[PDB]
Amino acid sequence: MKGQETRGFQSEVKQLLHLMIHSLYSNKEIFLRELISNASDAADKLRFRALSNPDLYEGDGELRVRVSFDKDKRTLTISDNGVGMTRDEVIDHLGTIAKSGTKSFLESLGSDQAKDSQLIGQFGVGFYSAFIVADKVTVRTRAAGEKPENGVFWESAGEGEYTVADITKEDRGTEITLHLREGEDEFLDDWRVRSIISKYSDHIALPVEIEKREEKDGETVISWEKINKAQALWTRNKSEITDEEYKEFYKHIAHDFNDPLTWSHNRVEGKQEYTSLLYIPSQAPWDMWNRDHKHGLKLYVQRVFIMDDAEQFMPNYLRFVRGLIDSSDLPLNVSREILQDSTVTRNLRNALTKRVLQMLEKLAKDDAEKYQTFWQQFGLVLKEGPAEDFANQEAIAKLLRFASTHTDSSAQTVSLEDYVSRMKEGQEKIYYITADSYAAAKSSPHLELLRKKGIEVLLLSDRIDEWMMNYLTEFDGKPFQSVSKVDESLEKLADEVDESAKEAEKALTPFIDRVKALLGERVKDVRLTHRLTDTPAIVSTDADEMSTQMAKLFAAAGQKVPEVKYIFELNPDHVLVKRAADTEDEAKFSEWVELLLDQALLAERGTLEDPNLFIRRMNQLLVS
Amino acid sequence: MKGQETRGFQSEVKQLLHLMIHSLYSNKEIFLRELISNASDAADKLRFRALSNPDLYEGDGELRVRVSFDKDKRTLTISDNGVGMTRDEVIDHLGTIAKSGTKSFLESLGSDQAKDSQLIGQFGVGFYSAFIVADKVTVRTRAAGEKPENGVFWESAGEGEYTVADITKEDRGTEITLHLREGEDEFLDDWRVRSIISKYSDHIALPVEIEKREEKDGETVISWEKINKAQALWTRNKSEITDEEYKEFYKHIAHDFNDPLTWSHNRVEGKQEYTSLLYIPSQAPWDMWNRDHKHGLKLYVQRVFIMDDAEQFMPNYLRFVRGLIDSSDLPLNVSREILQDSTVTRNLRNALTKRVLQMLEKLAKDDAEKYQTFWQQFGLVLKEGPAEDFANQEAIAKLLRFASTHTDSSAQTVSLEDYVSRMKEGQEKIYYITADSYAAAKSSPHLELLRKKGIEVLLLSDRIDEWMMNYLTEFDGKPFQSVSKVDESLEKLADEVDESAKEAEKALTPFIDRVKALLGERVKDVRLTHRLTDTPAIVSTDADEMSTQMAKLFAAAGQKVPEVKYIFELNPDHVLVKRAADTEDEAKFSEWVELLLDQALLAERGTLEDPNLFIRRMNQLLVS
Amino acid sequence: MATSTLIKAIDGDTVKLMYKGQPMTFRLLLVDTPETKHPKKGVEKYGPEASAFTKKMVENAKKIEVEFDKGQRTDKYGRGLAYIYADGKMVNEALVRQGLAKVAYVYKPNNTHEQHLRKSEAQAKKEKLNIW
């Protein structure tokens, strides 16, 4: 018996506070998971640096991570023979996880400790999670190959401080003795540690061995038996790999801990032989629009590590992809400038571009809810897609999700695919209403006309959607119906006008004469017609913005065109013109009339002859 | 300069088109003016070259122009003994009047060919006028010091093309042979031509002789009779010069054909020998706001031309004053550098500026008509006057004319001295108001408070006035005052703003937080400033259009720049912002804030990004 | 969700096709097959509106660039001298010292006091006696 009565948890902004949501993980053992994940990236750094100096092995070639456990003192001791950590990698990173001032980018200049967000994404997760179940975490590390006396002692019990002291350890790699709290004996029980280790260690290439100690009379046999499959997730059989081992390997190679929506483990041989394993994050990275990486693929050449977070294997449009790539054909002496310049990496990243296409298209058809999560985190990124490659824009348009009139929500749940299913009989034209603001899309009157006839509309309300609009003129052999104008097609059909009848027009005739002679030659003509809408005044146009774009049109007078002075039309019935008609007094008659004028001009230009004429009359009727 | 590639037909009225229309002049014989004009300045350029080397006279000590006429062949040959015209001085001059591609200053850089319009102002009038009476114009020059073998040929029938070649002309100077049109035999009559010689040449320094030959049976007698006095207008008796000679000589030295408003012919004799002759133009020259010169006087030293467009004798304050100054005191070998730095030439410029003071202050009382025409064309530049010299500030303020609420005309006629009489009992302060545009500022009805109080306010819609006024703090004891705004925004120190201080700011801090998160990145920054005023909010700027015209101010993003996103500062005290803070409702909260945003934005841009949204707001709130 | 028809249509005024960007990024995505360029347009219908109320506003003037008339003139004479050259001797900012602008305003005072007292003396006279 428990009884889950009531709930409620709403928290956003700042990475650290979002880490604390899945810090608990409903497991606690997420600490041991992430701890060995750093020992995997330590083994990575070692095998890379071993290409520049094999002295790092110190003779001992056994690269492994060993977990020993004690009941008496209550200490869980995880010790890898990786690169370890230098005095730098401890003080300049673990110190910046404690009190220093990394903030989000940096306390002072906002640049120096900019590259600690990547480092907190990995090591920062294991830090707090360790202290969830550990009373004390003692890190006694030593850099492999480098002098034993430059070994680093580190101590904290979870406070915003660190006790750092230089010690000697002839053993290379990192040795972390976590004094677990009394009660956390589970992580010190053999069977439990077996299940815990295996769950993540199977994604890890580095053999994770355990203290199989037999404590018998005289026979106190200490043996180290590997609980992991001891095989790198990209090179082992996809049949042996379960879906979680992918999700868990992501957290290592991405320097993260979130659950990826989907992945793509494909091997491609030929001239360019590589094994690719890409993923799709459930989060938008902090550094998405920053000049540093949080996207990228960990470069391996022939199962050996070179560099992490290498975005050089992925186009900037596909920056949403996170994973790794093991090229067996690529040079082992390769560098980031080789990756930027050399043609082999250009053809390699284009060979990875298609792995992205399959992974997205699948996720789209498979689970559009996960693809909706992807789209609301990485939409702006994929919006560059149809705007670059207009050739395959139809194929990318299946991936494109827009906000529509299907709901009054800002959620881009409706697709061009969804719309194909929503299409009416005879409908060859997909109706679009475009705006750089969501509230400006909601300022559209054309919506009421679509509402009456029962045909569906896209509410384009994003910044970079206008860039794709330069190319996205057709999808699936079906053109778009742009709301670009209202036209004189309804010329003599203007009878369906509520009750704006000739009774009103008899009272309009003196009003017409007064307005035309009040405005004079700054307007072409003031015609009183029956446009309903919430707009009290609207204009009629001849050609391109009346005449603001052509040859003959500017050949009329040159200066702005005389014809361009728009045809000032009003709604006699609408309360603004009606309250303007109630006011016969010249001062306030001209206040209303010239207001409605520059309002209509503002609608068909965006710019005014006199902005201050308008802004006086506009703000004055709002205030007085 | 190496132009080419410039295809863009858009030129009308600007100089050349306005020249051709009034180069007809209903007169025809206006050609004969410009021919002798070019002959006088040519002989005067030989006088300048003679200072640089006497050998360039080619043996001729007597420099004059000799008109001759062939009645039968219908060709009129005006040949001067001037400098002539060098080969490049024919090609890059007459050729640029016919076919080249000068645009205005240069099609390429807009600088190199800027001295084309200087030549078109005189010789372009002479070109058109010539082809009115002439079917064909054939130019044969030979430059001073250049051997007869380097004689130059130019030929055109009035087309958009020319024929330039090298010929032999043993005579130095210029030979203009106009083949008159069939019927135009009027200008082949000796008595006719001599009457037209005297009519123009009388105000010209260069002796104009005519071919008096007696070609009888066997008797080929040849003589030359000078019809002109052969003395300079400026050096001849002031009372012997008629008004018409001043007016037409203005047109000569101004490179124009309009009438001057007024003039002043003076001579100064004794210690410092200089004759001064200044004219006031009726129309603003094209160079008024351009980087090449037509402002200033013509420098002569002892009836010898040195340089045209010499603004060394006349400041930017009087740049519009066009005429000339001859000095028998200053050196013949005087340099453009000596003209700026020398004390003798400073005394020249000082006496000339004071002589224009005597002309302008007279002209105010002499003809308020011509003085009002003067100020509305030239007073924009004259307005630098006080705000460059504090010593004469009061005496320049006597020349300063502004606009005031005397009349709703944009004609700036009213002086400060006028305002001093026009002051009321206890009206010690000169009420002024600066503006961007007269029509814009006139649309403001707030000034009706000053109407009923019976105060008059200075209307300022100039560009440079806002700077000039910074020193124009007081005139005649009366201190100037801005009625732009004053209130409790400072009252004692800061916070004396009704009571909008810390207590308000407790509610304003989560308000700023909400607004900046609502707009996201649409705006740079949003503040609550306690400028009480009668306006709800105001946007602030760094530089021009915030940042939409400078290097760093475009090098930020590259689109419309994050800097260009205006700083939105509201008054929390204002009743509309009280109602905006009273609104907890999401859609209406944002609507109020964004109303004041696009309100202030439209006041500083004259343009909205998405107009329909802001219009829909005023429509809804006013229809209700 | 979908409101009966489909469309949650809302307020209306005017419409414009959004645009500001066209040159951006580099070139690298899928393959060669260039053909998605074929637009369309059309409009032929108008509907009614339901917006009719009258609220109250809070009267107050408005600031900006200001110029206008009155109807008034008169003149003087005296002073007159000129010599300068546009350089940078008196190129600087200041303007205004102090002024009036006391046109009109509505002042609202408030203050109250009641308060009272009572106090009086009495007239005590002396007795008189006379004899023969």
Curated annotation (Swiss-Prot), chain C:
Basic and acidic residues biased stretches: 113-129
Residue ranges of coiled coil: none
Region (Disordered): 113-132
Catalytic residues (UniProt): 27, 35, 79
Binding site for Ca(2+): 13, 32-33
Top-rank taxon, per record: Bacteria
Compartment(s) of residence: Secreted
Name of the protein this chain belongs to: Nuclease A
Naturally occurring in which organism (per UniProt): Staphylococcus aureus
Lineage of source species: Bacteria, Bacillati, Bacillota, Bacilli, Bacillales
Gene for this chain: nuc
